[PDB]
Amino acid sequence: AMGARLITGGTVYTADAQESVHARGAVLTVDDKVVAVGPAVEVEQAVQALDPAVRAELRRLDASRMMVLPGFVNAHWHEMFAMGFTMRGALRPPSDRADQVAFMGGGGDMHQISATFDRFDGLIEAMTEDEARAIAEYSMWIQLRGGVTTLGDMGSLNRPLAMVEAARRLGMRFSASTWASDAVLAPDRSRFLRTRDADTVLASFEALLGAVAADPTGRIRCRPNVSYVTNMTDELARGMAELVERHDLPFATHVGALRNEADAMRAYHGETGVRRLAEAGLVDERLMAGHSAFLDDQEQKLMLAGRAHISHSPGKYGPSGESALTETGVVPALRRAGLDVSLSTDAAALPGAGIAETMRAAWQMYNEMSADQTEVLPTDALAMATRIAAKGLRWDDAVGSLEPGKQADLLLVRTDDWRYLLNPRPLESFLWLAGSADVDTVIVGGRTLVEGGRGVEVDEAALRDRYLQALRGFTTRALRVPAEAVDPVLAEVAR
Amino acid sequence: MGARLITGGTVYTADAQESVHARGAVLTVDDKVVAVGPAVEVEQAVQALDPAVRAELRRLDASRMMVLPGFVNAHWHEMFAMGFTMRGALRPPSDRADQVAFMGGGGDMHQISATFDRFDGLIEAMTEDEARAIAEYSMWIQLRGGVTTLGDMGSLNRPLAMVEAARRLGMRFSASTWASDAVLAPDRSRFLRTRDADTVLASFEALLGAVAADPTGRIRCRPNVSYVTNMTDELARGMAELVERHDLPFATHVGALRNEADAMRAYHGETGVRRLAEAGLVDERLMAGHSAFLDDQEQKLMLAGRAHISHSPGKYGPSGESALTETGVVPALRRAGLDVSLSTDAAALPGAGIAETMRAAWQMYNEMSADQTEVLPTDALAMATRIAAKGLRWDDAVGSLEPGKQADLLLVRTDDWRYLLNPRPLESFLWLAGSADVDTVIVGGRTLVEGGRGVEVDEAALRDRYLQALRGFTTRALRVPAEAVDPVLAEVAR
Ligand SMILES: [Zn+2]
Ligand SMILES: [Zn+2]
């Protein structure tokens, strides 16, 4: 962006170190940065202290009927929209009555999960560049529409460079990754099959790192991940450790996700996920561990001693049949012991809970478990979806809070309807009765991308129609689903 | 009102089979559903009407919509009179100095008991106009969120003001009166009796007599006890006699808090469910609010009596209550075949509606059991419709879209990104939608809400009368200085 903007009159949640809230607050931005944030009258002094040239073109946004938030940082996300017709998706009968416990449910089917994750590379290769771009753009637009200004890929069924291109075009921030799986649990062999050379998987991530260095927007970073500790060799783990030290990067993986994980890990690898990561030298401040609930006392102590990070998705565990909240209570207990814990959406093949829905879930579920309405305050849920997530992503230098020097990444929500009436804590009303759909305005680096809940830098109808066309092509050609099953569903879409 | 055909959308019936019809239809004549099913089946029912009826048939195009039964919120309290005081409008915008209070940390049973015993005094200080203006706005919020049948389980309001508000808004209401005849005082080792049980019972009989004539089919009543802490044996035995004589449902709060059983034993010598069981109140009439802190014998009494539990998993966390995971008893009793419905409870400011509560149950019950099928989305719907109507003893008329039942239904728009390609729009609704996403509300075939707007109410007027009433009551009855109240009311974006 170019020029100064003053967003004044609303309640401003900063998610700074003090979790500061300013009723009748203001945010002054110049180009892509926040320069001043506080009470309207304090910020008005900063305006009078600008270069006259800058003040003369200052745009004033009246936000008195609005709440101002930092942009959501969704640090644990997967692009999976290519599986819309197959994965718990568009071909199910409308009735749910015949549904069965499957996949992640009932403790986890570890063989099926391992095998499914090892198949990703083959399905990515079956995708056209246009299908990748069209599906990435729509999938990432849905995140942006729900207030996500910084999105973290932790392993996607899509082409990394298609997703980088989608992020560049949409105007949002993206931490790109590659799919990394070099082992599969084969029960008929009584061993893991080493499915790939660790060094080839690491070279692919270095090729992505080289391509993202060439992007000049400052909006694209990358972070290597391992799909899941079941699908990781010692050689992949040691290589990731060496790569993240050499390039000074964050690192992400899924670990302690499922009840049946530890038993499969001991049987096939001879050791549980966190202890294998710890041996490789990966349990340290760089680590974002997805889920990380099924940890014994030694593994909890390794996470605390390393000052690691856990990303938690309490909005989506129930519908997947996962028990990564209440079966162990470990993630809330590690948060109480001073571990950084952020909130993330995870993802599915169809639209599911956004950050706003995940913030509500944490606020309900952590407080209920501890019989304590102060364990997660609404401003805690916000910090867990903004500043603390940015810290796990190692992007808190630039995003996650409204503070002088950080990027002008912010959301406006309308607070003038019955849901907000008389509440001096509009964030609380937002967690009670609002969601992703209630994000009104989205600004990234001082540029408005969304306004009145509408994209102002995209053709929403085009994003939708290209996604449906891409999904049809990929589903019929790559997934070999008959056109007879696909076309009736696409004919029912309300355009 | 005539015949209406609502066709083209996905129709959730919450009938006995939990039937769902993609490209389904609902045919209504006057106040009743006459046909529901596939569009082509229902189209046959249209051709089978009297020609006079068919000639004036109106068609609603619902092809871009999902159709639900009207939500039955069987456990609600009108508390909007406490907007400035109770966790409300005078708090600082920063939450950082908040402390565990009231229901939190196991429950402050002395403070809870004392607070509940003060209700009769505050209701008495209310004008009829204050009561009506606050009731109407409070109940409009329920209606706006898709609640077509609302159950009072003890309100800070005048019963007949709330009946009048329900009559005017066009929704269904089970009215109650406030019942508290004991308090747990810290200076005592036994309950202090505060009222004659017969006076408390006479108040409910005056309400029952006032609504007895009502011909609309929209007003019923159900006696409640506030909380078993504030109930004498004489009140309990009197309620039992009243509900037998008048053939009524019965509701109370029991096993709500960790610290309840210990206070109950210390002051009454017996826990809530056993005291209800002694009175003869643990039977099919009982809707027990919360009912999580039950030992083995009390769970057995609930199952043997075929009692009903109303659960509010949407609101436990923010109150610091642990009525879901600390015991896991409510999900376990549901698995054992006890009727369990979902309710909002209520607060003094707008909180989780039924839609938010349905999502909560769907996330939280499934996560606890590592089983995505323990509560299916259609289960969450049944728990907020047909099963709640059964607990309220109104399932004769409402709670499901079936021939003969009232034409009480909701339309939700399903044409945006949230719903795209999902053949289970209810699932997308629980993921990404809420109370605000209710588009149309029909009660007995009359449209009360359309495009998320009141059809036959001035929403700005309901708001402004509520704020006027709230100001009077807050400054006069709650003695909050005008200096604290007027700056808040001046900041309302009209
Ligand atoms: Zn994940
Ligand atoms: Zn209640």
Side-chain angles (χ1 to χ4, degrees), chain B residues 75-77 153 253 290 345-346:
Chain B
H75 169 213
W76 173 84
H77 313 272
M153 274 185 54
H253 296 63
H290 306 304
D345 210 332

Side-chain angles (χ1 to χ4, degrees), chain B residues 395-444:
Chain B
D395 57 326
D396 56 304
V398 302
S400 54
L401 300 176
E402 309 177 56
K405 304 231 157 148
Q406 291 285 298
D408 293 8
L409 59 110
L410 314 182
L411 312 178
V412 175
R413 296 186 76 82
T414 64
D415 58 341
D416 74 29
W417 58 272
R418 296 179 290 180
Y419 299 90
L420 181 57
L421 293 177
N422 196 348
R424 299 188 182 173
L426 180 55
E427 182 187 84
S428 289
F429 178 82
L430 295 186
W431 271 135
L432 277 164
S435 299
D437 293 293
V438 175
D439 180 280
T440 299
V441 184
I442 300 156
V443 180

Side-chain angles (χ1 to χ4, degrees), chain B residues 123-146:
Chain B
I123 294 163
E124 194 175 50
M126 209 169 271
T127 72
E128 305 163 271
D129 290 331
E130 284 171 342
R132 270 145 196 75
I134 297 162
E136 203 169 8
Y137 184 74
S138 195
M139 294 170 64
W140 155 251
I141 297 312
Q142 292 301 308
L143 180 62
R144 167 70 189 87

Side-chain angles (χ1 to χ4, degrees), chain A residues 96-97 106 326 368 371 379 425, chain B residues 95-96 98 105 325 367 370 378:
Chain A
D96 50 17
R97 298 321 296 182
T326 56
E368 186 288 332
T379 54
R425 299 181 181 182
Chain B
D95 50 14
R96 297 318 296 188
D98 280 7
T325 57
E367 186 287 333
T378 55

Side-chain angles (χ1 to χ4, degrees), chain A residues 164-223:
Chain A
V164 161
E165 215 284 326
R168 283 183 26 97
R169 164 161 179 189
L170 287 168
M172 64 192 299
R173 296 185 207 281
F174 186 58
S175 178
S177 205
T178 46
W179 187 256
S181 173
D182 81 329
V184 69
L185 311 179
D188 60 319
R189 305 298 209 79
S190 301
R191 70 181 177 89
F192 75 77
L193 304 175
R194 183 183 299 262
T195 57
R196 304 195 171 75
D197 180 359
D199 295 337
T200 301
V201 173
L202 294 166
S204 309
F205 181 83
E206 310 229 53
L208 174 61
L209 179 70
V212 166
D215 178 279
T217 67
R219 290 193 286 106
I220 318 296
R221 289 188 187 181
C222 50
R223 174 174 62 170

Side-chain angles (χ1 to χ4, degrees), chain B residues 232-268:
Chain B
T232 66
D233 293 347
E234 290 78 5
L235 185 53
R237 275 188 265 97
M239 286 288 171
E241 195 278 342
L242 177 89
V243 300
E244 143 62 7
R245 194 167 77 256
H246 288 299
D247 188 20
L248 296 170
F250 174 75
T252 191
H253 296 63
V254 65
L257 297 164
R258 177 207 302 153
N259 295 337
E260 181 185 312
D262 285 349
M264 289 299 294
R265 261 188 277 274
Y267 287 87
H268 293 281

